[PDB]
Structure formats: structure tokens, C-alpha cells
Amino acid sequence: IHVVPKLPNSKALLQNGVPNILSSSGFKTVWFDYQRYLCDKLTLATAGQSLESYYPFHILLKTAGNPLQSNIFNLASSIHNNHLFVENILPSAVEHGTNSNAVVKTEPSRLFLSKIKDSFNGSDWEVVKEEMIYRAENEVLGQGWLFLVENNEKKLFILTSNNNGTPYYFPRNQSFDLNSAISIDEFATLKQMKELIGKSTKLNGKVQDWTMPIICVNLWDHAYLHDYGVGNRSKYVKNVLDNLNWSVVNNRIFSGI
Amino acid sequence: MGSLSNEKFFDISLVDSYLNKDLKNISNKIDSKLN
Amino acid sequence: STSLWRSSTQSYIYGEYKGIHIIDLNQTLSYLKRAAKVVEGVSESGGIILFLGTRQGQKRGLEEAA
Amino acid sequence: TKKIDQSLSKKLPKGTIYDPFDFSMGRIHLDRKYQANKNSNRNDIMKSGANPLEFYARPRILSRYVTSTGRIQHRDITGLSAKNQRRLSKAIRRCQAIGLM
Amino acid sequence: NALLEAIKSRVPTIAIIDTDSEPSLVTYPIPGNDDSLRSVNFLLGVLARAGQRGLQNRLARNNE
Amino acid sequence: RLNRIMFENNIPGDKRSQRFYMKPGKVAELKRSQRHRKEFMMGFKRLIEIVKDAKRKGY
Amino acid sequence: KPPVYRLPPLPRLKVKKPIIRQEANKCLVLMSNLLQCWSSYGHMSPKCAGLVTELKSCTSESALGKRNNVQKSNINYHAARLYDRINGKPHD
Amino acid sequence: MKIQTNAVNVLQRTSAYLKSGLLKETPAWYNVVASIPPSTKFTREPRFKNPSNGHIIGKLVDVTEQPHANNKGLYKTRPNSSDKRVGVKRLYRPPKLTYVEDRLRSLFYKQHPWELSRPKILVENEIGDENYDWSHMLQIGRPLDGESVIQRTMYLIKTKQYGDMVEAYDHARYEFYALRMQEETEQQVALEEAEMFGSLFGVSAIEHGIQKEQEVLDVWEKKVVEETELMAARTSN
Amino acid sequence: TLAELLGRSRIAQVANNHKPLTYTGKKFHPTHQIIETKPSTLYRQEWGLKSAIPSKIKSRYLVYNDLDTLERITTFEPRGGTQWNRLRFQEMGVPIVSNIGRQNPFFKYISRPEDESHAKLSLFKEMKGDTDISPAAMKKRLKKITALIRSFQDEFKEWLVENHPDELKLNSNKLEDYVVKFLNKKLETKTNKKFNTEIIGTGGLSYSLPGKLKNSPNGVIQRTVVPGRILNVVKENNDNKWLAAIGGFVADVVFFQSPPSSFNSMGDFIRMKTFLFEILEASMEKNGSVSMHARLLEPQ
RNA sequence: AUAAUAGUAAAGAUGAAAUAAAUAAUUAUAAGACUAAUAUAUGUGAAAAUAUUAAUUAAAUAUUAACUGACAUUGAGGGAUUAAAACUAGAGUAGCGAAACGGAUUCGAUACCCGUGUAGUUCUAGUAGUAAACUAUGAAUACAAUUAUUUAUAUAUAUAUAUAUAAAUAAUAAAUGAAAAUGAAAGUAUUCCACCUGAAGAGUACGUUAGCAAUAAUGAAACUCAAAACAAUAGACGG
Ligand SMILES: [K+]
Ligand SMILES: [K+]
Ligand SMILES: [K+]
Ligand SMILES: [K+]
Ligand SMILES: [K+]
Ligand SMILES: [K+]
Ligand SMILES: [K+]
Ligand SMILES: [Mg+2]
Ligand SMILES: [Mg+2]
Ligand SMILES: [Mg+2]
Ligand SMILES: [Mg+2]
Ligand SMILES: [Mg+2]
Ligand SMILES: [Mg+2]
Ligand SMILES: [Mg+2]
Ligand SMILES: [Mg+2]
Ligand SMILES: [Mg+2]
Ligand SMILES: [Mg+2]
Ligand SMILES: [Mg+2]
Ligand SMILES: [Mg+2]
Ligand SMILES: [Mg+2]
Ligand SMILES: [Mg+2]
């Protein structure tokens, strides 16, 4: 059985929500309700099978290449992504419930701001945030996820997913919406991706992708509607990126010590 | 059916009802009902 | 399998099911508790306890037990 | 050559499910090894419940349990029960004495 | 072989006794499946922890 | 094909067995021993099949 | 219903002469075909050219080809290993 | 094998060694075994009830308990031959455990042969943790399968909502079909929706089968050719 | 109690099966329950059976008959391949349809006696559906029934003279009708084969409802294309259709007009090549087989 | 075996040989004996025995119902049946085959092999009551731990299996045993009968009884000796 993880300072979260982003009702929808909804569906889908003993991140990797397990993949991807989003927007990862700590001033580290300049042609963090808000509004028509990811070449770049798209495995990033029209450049990217997946010799037709997320923003209606409303998702993404917990985001960047 | 059977090759039910005044006490009963 | 029954074990059997004999776990628990107390006693007394098992795969359990 | 002996190719029936192993030589050999006349029971009068002794005047049925020369087949070959083998052999011997077999 | 040597040497023995196994050959039989590694390792684990508690109680009485 | 008929009706064996007379007791002994060897071979093949099946499954 | 025949206890379980599949030599079959080809179309007939070319290559270095002409049966090893387990003997 | 005596009396044989002086030092196990005596009866024990179905073992129905006529129309006035045979053996033979659910399980998989193709894991997690409310078929912790139907049927007959087992079984079967149809659609739609957002898959199930069949059909091609050439040479003879 | 727990154990959940593990006849559906073990348990030869499975086994799927035997082995085969046949059918997205247009067996429909007008056809099917019954147990259906039916003589000797006396005095053509109905009316309360073992619908192969369209980035899919293999190079003898091997099922392939020339060229090795097919329809027969009809889509 | 037919010059036998219009082939006729497969003597029968077919007569199984109310077990003496050989009469006599006479083999060959082949082997009516007539194991009853495999009866059903209770056979626990082994007895017990008391002499002598007869039953002692026998062990040896 997959159970909803306990969050630090949960009593505060159920009373005052997440300050500057979500209210108490908004956080109950995104985490206490939706995370319960996802975990229960995952348990029903995976109970009695070998996947029941694996964590959601491992389930999505195991099932990423199986077309008829997409339902399990979607549930595992959503569960992992939601706790990636709830973790970097959380007031404090440490449990100051008995310490009553009200001073958590987290700021981008030097390694993060050095990789931002290197990967974005000298752009500042503030400018990159504006590009992230723009990318979300023009690339994610409906539900999806906004990620700041790091690849095998030490370069930070921006990835957007439609519905439950994993950042780890490029064949399942779901960054192109094929319901609408696509340019020849987008079709080239899809055609090149298909060729890479066909070069793999494995009988499971799986490739190696070492991309890892650094920041996760939930773009689903379960996270913003109640507090911002239809059409105000760009005001929601702005608040999230301005109130990130950088103790978690800094720890996601590999240092090598 | 027993006594009230239509088979050409009947069983002992028919012969028993005859000697027991049943095939006759039912024929009259049916006819009396028809009356 | 009931075909391989050593009838000297009759008193431990709970019944037969699907062509095998089902061991009475109520007795297994009582015997296990008694055996466990003996191991605890010998260990607490400083005795040498040897764990013998020669079926494939048992080594890991045997090594940690020792 | 565009031809293969029937003994070297398996013809998968229609409506049946198959595995990749069904195209191998192991399947061919396995089908030969486990090839028994198990469908005889449904076509074997003497394995149905009839009394073989009622067929003593029907040489055509009895001739299915004798060799080309008229030698009664051993129970190992007929697969009958002891009683039916015993009754069938009596029927054949009686049929021979009457002048029909 | 080991069981008979234990008898000859007056060494008490514990063993898992399956339905085809002779109970009287051991001092303390444990009726149970001896063919599954899970069943064996479950019973062995319980006996091993029981020994550990005895060892910890002996090392504790020495300290105090 | 003709030779196969002879062997499946035991014609050559019967002809040879009819050359000399054998006492009824000796005939009965030979019939008993032959049946035992036939049945013994069937039991042997059954055990070899179990061996091969057990070997295939890794026993 | 098919009669099972159970053996008595035996001192051993062994096949006297285990059967082995001896694959036919590729060079010998090539020679057997060429010889037949000459029997029908005639000796040195242009129809058997390919046969002659193949035979020469098969036999160029070794007249019977370079083959792993070694095969042994293991039935007796397994039969002796598993007999005590599978014979169904009653307990002592 | 004979009931052994020397394995359970190690304490008494050791005590004779110590009392005589043949063994100078008390063994470490000696005190432990003395406090925890071995069981040494090794007896066969009778049993008077089948634990599975509660059937009583060892009860003889006397003729006084059968006053009415039987199915043949005859009264029973004397014990029959079976009643006069001692039945001690039945007291000692391990009872055959039976369950009504076993009959339904065989029925379910005879009616739905392809449910067998859904892999089942026999390895248990913890039987003691199962907190199931069989008012509904779905349960957190276990898959939806034939057993879900059987347990639902038993709950219906146990709550007396239905009287006949067949009616309860049919009711459970339809609940099972509804849940199976919702899952077959969630999987089809999830695949369709993913492809519409640019999901790519290396090998499909159909493709996996084709590749495996090719590997087998390639070895089969070689052997066929080889065995169609040995025949030609052997037949030439 | 231990007995209660045992009845609900995972081993108890598997229905007793002694069907041959090595069957060489015609296979139409799964015969054995596939058992699966997780990778962690496989590393320890643990499958939840009585004994450890030999380490030689690398598959995670098996089928078994007996937990233990007199030969001190488990009777099992390390295969689980009927699951891939079902999943490949699911990938072909062809719903199973009734060629007779019968009601959907998976829906609780309100049926009426339209087909119950054959009361004499099926009431006697109980004694006449004895194709493979013993010569004396089937004969026990003659005396055992005769007594049961003969116990209702008084009831039918009064009802018939009280509800249809004219027929008893005119003709038995209608009396026979009242007899067939009487027994059925007095048998519906009874339980004769109250449990029906016949396969219900698809048998679990597919729970897909017909009607749904397959959306794709290139538009709605109108024809399903599936790779396959032609088994024979000559149409099935006596049949106007060849045989193909598509997704673990043997289908009947109908060609547009002509047979591609690769047939004659390849010959008996035609199965060595993969062709593209279109699955027209899929039906289910009473034997529990799937009647898949295909069409050899050829590049044009 | 005889006859016919065409057709021939060798045939037959053996380790190799030799002794006594054919052999082979196709027809026709006659005679006696025997009973291929199935088949396991499975089974049946007191044993001896019993397997080509049919018929008549006699006997034989399981369960249930009713009935009798210990009427049972065993069985000295006695009675009956009893393979093959043998005998007394009358038939039969193909094949086989003591003996006899021949042919070979051999140093010799009163043998083994070959030929001619009488009694006998067959039937009917009798005599006789003997066999390694053996499971070398008297009959009956109560009882004791398992498995496998068949068979039988019964029960159930979601109809073909499943569940029961007996019998048989196989392998065993325990037990017993000099051991080999026995295994439901060669175990645990009870009841009745037969029989044994070192080897050899001897199943002989004498007598008696029975039989047409051969013989069968019953059945010793003296003298002499310290032997004699069984199971198992390790060797040696084996055409
Ligand atoms: K006999
Ligand atoms: K009295
Ligand atoms: K008396
Ligand atoms: K007497
Ligand atoms: K004569
Ligand atoms: K004898
Ligand atoms: K006696
Ligand atoms: Mg075991
Ligand atoms: Mg002549
Ligand atoms: Mg005969
Ligand atoms: Mg016998
Ligand atoms: Mg007497
Ligand atoms: Mg005379
Ligand atoms: Mg002579
Ligand atoms: Mg006389
Ligand atoms: Mg004499
Ligand atoms: Mg005598
Ligand atoms: Mg005799
Ligand atoms: Mg008597
Ligand atoms: Mg005398
Ligand atoms: Mg001796």
C-alpha cells in the first residue's frame, strides 16, 4: 500500500496553508486530498503485482517504456511530481514544530546562480523566472508541470510537461501538444527522439537519460483554481517562484564533495 | 400422467386406476364438471 | 505430500489440503517459543551455539544468526 | 528449394493461441513424443460402456481389435479394462467359431 | 549424521520437523515447513534474536 | 512393408518356437519371466522420464 | 487409468548404452551429393560444378572437415544423482 | 523408524556423568534444559472434529435416532454392517479440510478462463494486517481478481441479503464486470492521451512478440534446411 | 482459527487444477493460473509455494499442478505466456462482438421468455446433454428422475383436470405442452445445474465495449494495422482463406483480390516474413476460442 | 499318408556327416491328436487342476430386508478327491517317443546328435493313492504404523471427476528372527490338529494290511562315529 508521506509542520499547514502561495483550503486540495487520491488509485492499480514494493519514482522508470502501463505511469509520475512541488514550496523542511521557528530566509546558492548565468547566456535569476512564467502560459494549455532541470552537461534548462509528464525520461516528457498544430522544427525534435529510441538494443526499447529536476511547479487546477481562479495561473506561478524553499532546491544540485 | 396418459404403451397405473374406481370416478367427475 | 507422510508426525498435523499435510501452527508457536527460550538460555550462559543448514540459499540466514 | 516436409513444419489450427516456441523444432519433437491415441475413447465403442459380447455377430466392429492376420490385440494396445478385454476376446473367439470372422 | 553425533555426544539439538521428518531424533522439535527459505529464515530469525537477547542480558549483568 | 507385418504378428518368432516341444511348466516359466521383463522396462522408462523432466526444471 | 508400473528398489538406475545423436559430416554429405550428381548428369558434367567447388572447400584442409566430433550423454550422471529423490521409496 | 530415546534424555545421561564424576564440569546447556523439559510422549492423538467444516468425527447415529423411513421407504430396525465396524482409524487420520469457497473458485475460473492469464502473486505480505470491508468489492491492499468475487459472494450470503449462493454469486459477478470495464477504459484512454501529448515508446507488446518469433523462426530455418539435406542424401541410398 | 485463515490464504485462492502441464492438443484459452514472483523473492527462490523453486529458473512466471508429489518435486512449468496473448489482444483494440447479436453477458439485462418457448428443448437437455456421461451414471438419470417425476403425478392428475379438462377428453397435443411447462414450473424452484460452468462471454479476454474511436495525432484511426505472419503458402484446404499468426492468435486472412507474389517465391518459408494485416472483426465461439478475421494489407 | 497334376534330379539331416519319376509346388481324399493371438493362470477350484465355440445340469459374489438365536472353531480315527509314470480289459494310433536295431562322435561312447521307431502318450470302464503333490510356510479368531497401484460397492454433484468403505498386490515402520528375511505374518495373542528330538544305518530289514501287479501304508534295532547341518562373511575359481 502506498501511503501519503507525512509533511513537516503539518499542523501549521492544515491551519495557515503555505504563506504567500496557497491558503489552508488550497493546500488541502493540492496535497491532503489530491495526494490521497493519487496514492489510493496507485495502490488499486499496483496491489497484487510486483510494482507494489517499489517507490513511485522507480515505478515510473520501470513502466516508462510500456504502452499499456501508461495509467500506472501517470499515477506514479503525478505522485512523484506533486511531492517535488510541495517540497520546494514548503516553509521549512526541518520540523520546527516544538522549536517554533519563524525565521526561514533561504536564498539561491552560489552554485545555482553560477549555473544560471552559464546556461542562460548571462541572464539573471529574475529574468529566468520571467521566461519560466512565459513558458508555462504558452506551452501548457491545460494541466501540466513546469520544471527547471539539469542535464548530463551541467546545463540548466526549462522543461514543461503536459498532464503527467516526467522530467527524467525524455521519451515521456510530453512537452509537445499534438492535439494542436506543430511546426516543422517540433516535428524534427519528435522524429529525432524516435530515432534515438530505435538505436537502443535492449528488448525493452529503453534509453539512458540523466536529466534531473531542480524546481517543480504544479500547473494543475488542483493547485491554483481555488485561490487564484481560471486565468490567473501566471500570478500563481510568479508567487511560487518567488517563495521557493532554497534549502531544498540547493540540495538538488550536485556539488561533488 | 399415469392413469390419464395418452401413450399407447401405458404403465400399471392405468390398470390400477381401473380396478380402484379412479379412471371411472374421474371420468364422471370431469363429465359432471362439464355439465 | 500426504504420499510422503511419516506417520510419527501425526500429532503435529492440522489436516490435509491440496494433497499436502497442513502443520498445526498453534503447536508450532508453542514449540517455537520453547525452542527460543532454550537458545536464549544457552546464549545467556555463554554456551557455543552451532547453526547447521546445508540447503541452497541458507548461508545468508545462517551467517547472520551466528 | 521452396518445399519442406510436413514432419518439419507445424500447422497451427485456426482459433488457437500460440507462443513463439510453437514455431521451433522442440514443438515438433514434443508433439511426436506426446502423440497418443487418446481420441479413441470417444470413437471406441468398447470404451463407452457397451458389452463387447453383444457384438459377436458384427464382425466389422470386432475386426477393429485384431491385427491384419486376425490376432487379438493385447490389452496394452487396446487400452480396455480387464472386463472389456475379457469380454471382447470371448466375442471374437465366438465370432470365429460361428463362421463370421 | 549430525543428529546421531549430537545424540552420541549428549549435545541438545533444535530442528525444524517437517511432516516427513522424525521428531524423536531431536531434543526440541519445531514443526514447520523446512523447504521454503522464507519459512526457514523466519524461524531461524526468531531463534537468532532470542539468542541475541540472551547475549545482551549476559553482557549487561557484567557491566552492572 | 511385408517384413513389418511378419514382426507385428510375430510370425518368425512363432515359427521358431514351434520347431521343438517345450514342457508346459517350462512354457509357463518363460511366459512369466518375459512379462516381468516387459513390465520392468515400462517401469524403467517411466523413471527415466521423471529424471529428464526433473533435470530440465533444475532439480 | 493408464497402467503405472512401479519398479522394486534397485541397486542403480543406469542406461547401458545411452543413445547419442551423431550429426552427419558436412563433407561426407557433400561428397554423397556430388557422387549422385555425376551418376545422373554424368562425370564432370557442368551441372555439378558448384558441388565440386563446395567439396573442395570442405575438404581443403581436413578430408572430413573441421568439426567438433565429440558428443557424450549425461543421462547416467543425472539418473544416479536423482534416483534416491524420485523413486518414491517409503521412509526408514 | 523407532521412537528414539537418547535425543530427549541428554540431561539424564549427562546427570549420570556428573554424579559419578566421569564429567567434572557442568555443561552450559545443563541448567537451561533442566528448566525447560523436552516433550517425550510422541503419541498419536485422536481428533473429534474437522476444523474446516465443523463436522463431528467419531459419532455413530443409533437406530433410535432414525425413527422415520429412509429414501427407499424402509425403516431401520437394526445396525448395518458399517455401523458394526470399529472406526478408530478415522479418529487418527488427518481430516481433509474443505471449503465452500473452493467450489466457487473452480466455477469462476471455468466461466472466465482468461482470468487465469492475469498473474497472481502467492507470496504473502502479512495476513494479520488485512482489514477488509466486503460491503464493497474493491479493497485497498489487494488486486481485483476472482478472489474479490468469492469474498463478496460470501459476505452477501453471510449478511443474508441473498439466500441462494447462485444469486449472490451472480450479483458479485456483475459488480466485477463493472470494475473490469472501468479499468479496461482507463488503460486504453491513458495510452491514447499520452500519445496525443508526444509520448514515445520503443517496443509495443505486438512488436515484442514479432521479435521473439523471428529469433525462433531463424533457428528453425537452419535446422529445416539441414534436415532436408540429410534426408536427400540418406534417401539416395 | 487456523482453518478459517487457510481457506482465505493465497494458495487456497488458486483453484485445483490437474490438467496436463504438457498439452499438445488445440489450445483455445488459458488452462493454468500464472504464478508470478517479485525479483527480490526470485533471488531467494521464494514463490509462495511449499518448496523453493530450483535456482536454474530465471523466469518470474510459472504454472503448477501439485505443491508436492511422491517424487519429492513440484510439478510446474516456468512459463507465463498466456498473459502476453491477452495484452497483445488489448493492444489491437478490436472489441469482441457477437456474430449472433446476443445480449451482452456482462450487463444485467431484463430478459423475457422469448427463448423459453423451447421448454421441451432444454428441460430434456438435462438428460439428453449426456454426450460424455458414464453408461450407468447416465442410466441413474432414468430411475432417479422417474421417481422424482413420478412423485408429482397426483399434482398433475388434478391440475390438468381442473385447468384444461377439455384436452384430456379431446387430444394430447396440448397435454404434452402442459406437461413440459409443469415440470419446468416445478423445477425452476429446484436446483438442477443451478451453477452453469459454460464460458460467460469473452471469458475475460476483453472487457472493452464496442463504439469508441481511437484518436491519434494523425487523426482518428479508421483501420487497425497489425504486423503478422502467413503460416501456409496454400489456402486452407476446403477453405477460401489462408491462415495468419497475429499477436498470439491464428486468424483467417482474406486478400483483396490476388495473393502477393512473395507467396510462390518464399514457399514453405513464407512464415519467415512479416506482413501487415487489418483486423476486420473478432468473434467468440462456444468452445472458448476467438475467431479473428484479418485482411492482408499490401503496400500499394 | 495316399492319389492326381505338370515339372524336374537330387532330396533330407548335421557342428560336419552317415544311416534310412522323389523333394518342392497346386489340387483331392482320409485319419488321429492338439488348441495361435487374447493371456496376466488374471481369475476360478479343497488340492490335484483349469484358457477354441455352444448348450444342459450343479456350485460360486456384494449389499439390503426379514428370520434363526451360539446352531461355532478345530478335528484323532474315518471318508472323499488326488499330476506324471504304471497296471487290467476293449477301441484307437497321425505326431511324439522309454526299449530294441542301426548311423555318427570318441582312445572307448551301453551316452549326448541322426535314422527306423515297439510300449506309452488318446478314448471308454477300472486298479492304484504316489510327486521339489512347494508358498519346501496346517486351520480359525482378535489385534497393530504408512504409502502406492488396481478392483468392487456406495455417495455426491458446478459432470465427469471428488469423497468413503472393503479386497488384492507392491514397497515399508514397528515387531520378530541364527541370519537371509517375514510384514499383515515368519508381528502381538488365543484355540485345535499334524510333526521333530545328532549323523549314518534307513524310509532300509522283518512282520502286517491293501492291491492283478509294479508297489503303497505302517516301520525298527545292532554295529560305528564326534560328528553332522543352516544363514551369513572374505576369498579363490568358472568351457
Ligand atoms: K491362478
Ligand atoms: K439362548
Ligand atoms: K466338533
Ligand atoms: K483324519
Ligand atoms: K501311437
Ligand atoms: K512351487
Ligand atoms: K491340520
Ligand atoms: Mg520438507
Ligand atoms: Mg510333396
Ligand atoms: Mg491360447
Ligand atoms: Mg492368483
Ligand atoms: Mg473340519
Ligand atoms: Mg491297453
Ligand atoms: Mg532316437
Ligand atoms: Mg480310485
Ligand atoms: Mg515311492
Ligand atoms: Mg510324501
Ligand atoms: Mg503342482
Ligand atoms: Mg471353514
Ligand atoms: Mg515302502
Ligand atoms: Mg548355505
Q: Neighbouring chains of I at 3+ CB pairs within 8 Å?
A: A, B, C, D, E, F, G, H
Do the Cβ atoms of E48 and C64 come closer than 8 Å? yes
Contact state of I161 with B26 under an 8 Å Cβ cutoff: yes
Task: Name the H helices within I123-206.
Answer: 125-128, 140-150, 153-163, 165-170, 175-187
Do the Cβ atoms of D40 and D23 come closer than 8 Å? no
Phi, psi of A71 (to 5 degrees): -60, -45
Chain H residues bordering chain G (beta-carbon distance below 8 Å)? 1, 229-230, 232-233, 236
Q: Neighbouring chains of G at 3+ CB pairs within 8 Å?
A: C, F, H, I
Kindly calculate the radius of gyration of chain B based on its CA atoms and give it in whole angstroms. 10
The residue type of E54 is: G
Task: Name the H helices within A47-124.
Answer: 56-63, 70-88, 110-119
Is the shortest CB-to-strand distance from I142 to strand J under 7 Å?
A: no
Q: How far apart are CA H115 and CA I14, in angstroms?
A: 11
Sort out which chain G residues have CB atoms less than 8 A from H236's CB and list them: 32-33, 36
Sort out which chain H residues have CB atoms less than 8 A from E11's CB and list them: 10, 29
Sort out which chain C residues have CB atoms less than 8 A from I11's CB and list them: 18
Q: How far apart are CA H154 and CA H165, in angstroms?
A: 8
Sort out which chain H residues have CB atoms less than 8 A from A176's CB and list them: 197-198
Is the shortest CB-to-strand distance from H111 to strand J under 7 Å?
A: no
Nucleotide closest to residue G90 (CA–C1'):
J172
Contact state of I175 with B13 under an 8 Å Cβ cutoff: no
**Sign of the dihedral defined by the CA atoms of residues H169, H171, H177, H180, in that order:** negative
Do the Cβ atoms of G67 and G75 come closer than 8 Å? no
Q: Chains C and H: how many Cβ contacts under 8 Å?
A: 58
Do the Cβ atoms of H140 and A44 come closer than 8 Å? yes
CA-based nearest residue in chain G for residue I70: G88
Quick one: DSSP state of residue A29?
I
User: Which chain D residues 41-80 have CB under 7 A to strand J?
Assistant: 41, 66-67, 69-75
The three-class DSSP label of residue A118 is: helix
Chain C nearest C-alpha distance from G7 (Å): 17
Is the shortest CB-to-strand distance from H2 to strand J under 7 Å?
A: yes
**Would you call I67 an interface residue with chain C, using a CB distance cutoff of 8 Å?**
yes
CA-based nearest residue in chain G for residue F44: G7
**Would you call H90 an interface residue with chain D, using a CB distance cutoff of 8 Å?**
no
Q: How far apart are CA I47 and CA H16, in angstroms?
A: 49
Give residue G56's region: left, alpha or beta (phi > 0; psi -120 to 50). alpha
The three-class DSSP label of residue D60 is: helix
Q: How far, in whole angstroms, is CA I166 from its chain's centroid?
A: 48
- Which residue's CA lies closest to nucleotide J151 at its C1' atom? D82
Is the shortest CB-to-strand distance from G10 to strand J under 7 Å?
A: no
Tally Cβ neighbours within 10 Å of residue A19.
10
Nucleotide closest to residue C2 (CA–C1'):
J147
Q: How far apart are CA I100 and CA D42, in angstroms?
A: 30
Q: How far apart are CA H237 and CA I19, in angstroms?
A: 45
Give residue H61's region: left, alpha or beta (phi > 0; psi -120 to 50). beta
Chain I nearest C-alpha distance from A207 (Å): 22
Long-range (24+ apart) CB contacts under 8 A made by A64-69 are A64/A166, A64/A169, A64/A171, A64/A172, A64/A206, A65/A171, A65/A204, A65/A205, A65/A206, A65/H201, A65/H202, A65/H203, A66/H201, A67/H191, A67/H201, A67/H204, A67/H205, A67/I91, A68/H187, A68/H191, A68/H205, A68/I87, A68/I90, A68/I91
Task: For chains F and I, tell me whether 3 or more CB atom pairs sit within 8 A of each other.
Answer: yes
CA-to-CA separations, I174 to H160, I149, I167, in angstroms, rounded: 42, 19, 6
Is the shortest CB-to-strand distance from D10 to strand J under 7 Å?
A: no
Grid cell of F53 as nine digits: 523432466
CA-based nearest residue in chain H for residue I109: H174
This PDB structure is determined at a resolution in Å of 2.3
Chain H nearest C-alpha distance from A145 (Å): 13
User: Which chain C residues 6-25 have CB under 7 A to strand J?
Assistant: 7-8, 10
Query: Comparing C-alpha atoms, which of D71, D101, D73 is closest to residue D85?
Result: D73
Sort out which chain C residues have CB atoms less than 8 A from G88's CB and list them: 3
The residue type of I60 is: R
Chain H nearest C-alpha distance from I203 (Å): 4
Is the shortest CB-to-strand distance from G90 to strand J under 7 Å?
A: yes
Cβ under 8 Å to A: I residues 65-104: 87, 90-91
Beta-bridge partners for I251? I244
Chosen from A38, A160, A174, A203 to mutate, greatest number of chain H CBs within 10 A: A174
Query: Comparing C-alpha atoms, which of D21, A61, I92, I34 is closest to residue H204?
Result: I92
DSSP codes of every residue in C24-64 = -HHHHHHHHHHHHHHHHHHHHHT--------STT-HHHHHH
Contact state of I41 with H123 under an 8 Å Cβ cutoff: yes
Question: Which nucleotides on chain J have any atom < 7 A from a protein Cβ?
Answer: 36-42, 52-54, 63-67, 96, 143-152, 156-161, 163-166, 170-175
Sort out which chain I residues have CB atoms less than 8 A from H121's CB and list them: 10, 35-38, 48
In the block, cell 522508470 appears at: A61
Chain H nearest C-alpha distance from G43 (Å): 17
Tally Cβ neighbours within 10 Å of residue D9.
16
State how beta strands A156-162 and A144-150 pair: antiparallel
The residue type of I264 is: N
CA-based nearest residue in chain G for residue F56: G78
Breaks (C-N over 2.5 A) in chain D follow: none
Q: How far apart are CA A97 and CA A99, in angstroms?
A: 6
CA-to-CA separations, G88 to A16, C4, G7, G9, I3, in angstroms, rounded: 73, 8, 10, 10, 30
Q: How far apart are CA H154 and CA H104, in angstroms?
A: 10
Q: How remote is the CA of residue F24 from the centroid of ligand 5, in Å? A: 21
- Which residue's CA lies closest to nucleotide J42 at its C1' atom? D82
Sort out which chain H residues have CB atoms less than 8 A from E23's CB and list them: 42
Q: How remote is the CA of residue H81 from the centroid of ligand 19, in Å? A: 21
Chain H nearest C-alpha distance from E25 (Å): 6
User: Which chain H residues 187-226 have CB under 7 A to strand J?
Assistant: none
Q: How far apart are CA B17 and CA H128, in angstroms?
A: 69
Grid cell of C6 as nine digits: 511419516
Of the CA atoms within 13 Å of residue I187, those in its CB half-sphere come to: 18
**Would you call G36 an interface residue with chain F, using a CB distance cutoff of 8 Å?**
no
Phi, psi of I180 (to 5 degrees): -60, -45
CA-based nearest residue in chain E for residue I74: E35
Query: Comparing C-alpha atoms, which of C24, I74, I14 is closest to residue H99?
Result: I14
**Would you call G87 an interface residue with chain F, using a CB distance cutoff of 8 Å?**
yes
Burial of A117 (0-12, 13-18, 19+ CB in 10 A): middle
Do the Cβ atoms of I195 and H166 come closer than 8 Å? yes
Sort out which chain A residues have CB atoms less than 8 A from I40's CB and list them: 53
CA-based nearest residue in chain H for residue G40: H236
Nucleotide closest to residue D74 (CA–C1'):
J38
Beta-bridge partners for I294? I253, I279
Quick one: DSSP state of residue I259?
-
Q: Neighbouring chains of C at 3+ CB pairs within 8 Å?
A: E, G, H, I
CA-to-CA separations, G83 to F47, G7, G12, H118, in angstroms, rounded: 8, 12, 8, 37
